[PDB]
Amino acid sequence: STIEEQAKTFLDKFNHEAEDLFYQSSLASWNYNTNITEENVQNMNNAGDKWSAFLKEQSTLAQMYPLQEIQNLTVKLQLQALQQNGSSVLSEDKSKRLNTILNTMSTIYSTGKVCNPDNPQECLLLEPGLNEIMANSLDYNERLWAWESWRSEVGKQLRPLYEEYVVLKNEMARANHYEDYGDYWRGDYEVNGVDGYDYSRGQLIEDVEHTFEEIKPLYEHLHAYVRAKLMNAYPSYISPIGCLPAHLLGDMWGRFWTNLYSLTVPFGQKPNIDVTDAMVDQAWDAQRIFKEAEKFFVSVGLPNMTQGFWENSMLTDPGNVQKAVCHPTAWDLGKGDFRILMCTKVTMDDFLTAHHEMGHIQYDMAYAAQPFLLRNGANEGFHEAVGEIMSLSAATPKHLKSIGLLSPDFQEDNETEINFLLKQALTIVGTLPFTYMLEKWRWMVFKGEIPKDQWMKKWWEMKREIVGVVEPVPHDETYCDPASLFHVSNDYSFIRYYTRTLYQFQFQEALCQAAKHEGPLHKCDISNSTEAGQKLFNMLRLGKSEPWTLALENVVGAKNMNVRPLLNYFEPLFTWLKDQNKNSFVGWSTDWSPYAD
Amino acid sequence: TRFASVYAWNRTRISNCVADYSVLYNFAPFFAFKCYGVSPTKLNDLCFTNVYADSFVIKGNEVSQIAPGQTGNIADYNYKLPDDFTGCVIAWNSNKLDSKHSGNYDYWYRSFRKSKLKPFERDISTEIYQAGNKPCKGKGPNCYFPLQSYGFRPTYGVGHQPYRVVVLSFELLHAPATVCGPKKSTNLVKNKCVNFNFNGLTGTGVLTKSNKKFLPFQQFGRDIVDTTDAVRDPQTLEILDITPCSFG
């Protein structure tokens, strides 16, 4: 016998118990999220502990199968996935301290609250009230007060915890032969051992910077337009050449500019495209939404759903008699068990989220044929991109008119198209510079290019330089405003969203070219096109057994991220912005600040 | 009620009876069945010396492996049919009966063995499968158990549901066969020139009642010229005479 046969037998023995315990943990988590009871919480905790013990006992045993003597690529990938040490390489005390700091930061973020100075007994939470002020208020004083109080109450307690967290993550990365924790995150994009498809971590940074520089003109035009509109929306509060305040971006952190559509609408006299009223008139429900989504996914050429999918998925609100998490989540249990947890209502946003979750479930069923260790997408953003392309295809006016929602007398005009493109840009293009800036700041903090006494200073400098956002109050080093975000405090990366934003447009262009679409890109409908769906499924069925570059080239013909799809999509909006900004200044100045007076 | 495991399938001998396949739909009519080298329509009147029936339970995806020339975890180490097998393979779903909550581990299947099994071979050995070059001893690294449990759950997909499979075998030898197929039998008309067939005796003539007295072991009589002139009803045991139809 050889080492390869021993590794194959070990994987055959492993996969059975692995899938069994994974199905058990998934069922426990489903029972928890569908019925919040003490028994369900205890079962979920027990399943998590059992899964952790299983991952621990399977580790340190696969090390007896060296990768240098393995010829099969699948066996080598499975062994590499089983020979991961994680944070267990450090001492027990350091790991316990890291876990305690993570739990404390998560608790502080979840328990974030802002109390009224005039009444200490009245307090508002982050999501229920603060974000709502930022979405639906125009009082500058109240927004400034909230933006100051939230950070003064949250960030001032997370600075040393975040410092020690970064220190421990850097120590763990150096223990795993990595330069820093950002390098450990970028290592997921690294590809080796494939001729013509290798990828390095520095190449990722180079491509991200190149895409940022390519989006920079369009983002500058969009920012100039938004500033010119806020000059009338907020008189004497927006500088003609200065940066925009942080509390006037539509939310608490400035992630998405979707809330600014009501203040930056080009043509307010045109009606908004919304099929919610048509769905209510036709007496639709969650069942009808999911059935139409299934019909679309069959017309595009994807497999049907199973009976257990419709029998187990909680597609309706269980009410107060059974507390459940109405957050739309996709669940993969294995052994042919696929469930969706979503309290779907009669709206267009839920109609698109249903197609998103259905694309997720289709990707799950596609990579289910691969071994359990390979039952995952080629990248973290692949599932979200496959969901978003289907959501955009369903959001097209052609698809909504073909299914009987839009009236047959519906007429299209250039103003509605421009408004839709501007909304899609504020929802999609607006978050890309902020995401890039935040990810670069986190990478520089992990690597150590920014001294500890200048963290917030460099944060605000990068903000003003990249996102064109100036802070109203110069917060010193005692604040930890960047850690006041979910993805930052719960140890999640942000480059995944940028990669998904690129991949969704790339996949959309590829499917529209495969479907022989003619005309604008936003008018492309992949309905009744089995070729594009089959081509997408041919890549979705591979899972993580192949590098992301090969999976990307099998769909769009490119081995790297491409910015041309976004430009081809926003070309009409780009021309409109270039024509409208002839009377205003393009760009932003980092010297102006609200506290300069 | 309880079927045997796939690695320990039992063989049931069937002889000295008529093989009626219509009663199978009584116990579940979802009997998806495929035949090889024979057809169920032509099997309704064939004769065989001995009939053997095997039974075992497998998953949904493993049903396609029970066929001549297949290869898989079941076809190589649990149960295999010869390349020239003559018979039919019957299978049906059993998720509503053989599956229990928290997994049903009562069924086991062989997954690791040093050699593949021959057709119609049974092996229940539980020796530890030695994967490494070093001699195996005890249990640990490079040590694997040859049997694995299914763990049937009612919420599993159709491909993982338990399926009860029954294979019928037929054998013919130089011995008087005792298993044959179902027959027919019609009515009985009299005073008419019609064709008749009494338990293999063919002819033509008019059938009327006679006054002969046959002994309990007699079946048919003959006259001086050794021609058939009287027979008995196999279902009435009465005496009937045979007369040739008119001619001239």
CSV table of N, CA and C in Angstrom, one decimal, chain B residues 1 50 61 80 114 133 172 209 224 240:
chain,number,residue,atom,x,y,z
B,1,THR,N,-41.5,-8.8,8.6
B,1,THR,CA,-41.5,-7.6,9.4
B,1,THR,C,-40.1,-7.0,9.4
B,50,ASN,N,-36.2,-25.4,-8.8
B,50,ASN,CA,-36.1,-24.7,-7.5
B,50,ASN,C,-36.2,-23.2,-7.7
B,61,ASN,N,-30.0,5.4,-3.7
B,61,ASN,CA,-29.0,5.4,-4.8
B,61,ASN,C,-28.3,4.0,-5.0
B,80,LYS,N,-23.9,-9.3,-5.2
B,80,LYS,CA,-23.7,-9.2,-6.6
B,80,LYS,C,-24.4,-10.3,-7.3
B,114,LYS,N,-10.4,-6.8,1.6
B,114,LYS,CA,-9.2,-7.0,0.8
B,114,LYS,C,-9.6,-7.5,-0.6
B,133,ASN,N,1.1,-0.6,5.7
B,133,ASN,CA,2.1,-1.7,5.4
B,133,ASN,C,2.5,-2.4,6.6
B,172,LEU,N,-32.9,-24.9,-12.9
B,172,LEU,CA,-33.4,-26.0,-13.6
B,172,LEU,C,-32.3,-27.1,-13.6
B,209,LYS,N,-73.2,-37.3,-20.9
B,209,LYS,CA,-73.1,-38.0,-19.7
B,209,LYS,C,-73.2,-39.5,-20.0
B,224,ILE,N,-61.5,-51.4,-27.3
B,224,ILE,CA,-60.7,-52.5,-27.8
B,224,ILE,C,-59.6,-52.0,-28.8
B,240,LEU,N,-67.8,-38.6,-18.3
B,240,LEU,CA,-68.3,-38.1,-19.6
B,240,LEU,C,-67.8,-38.9,-20.7
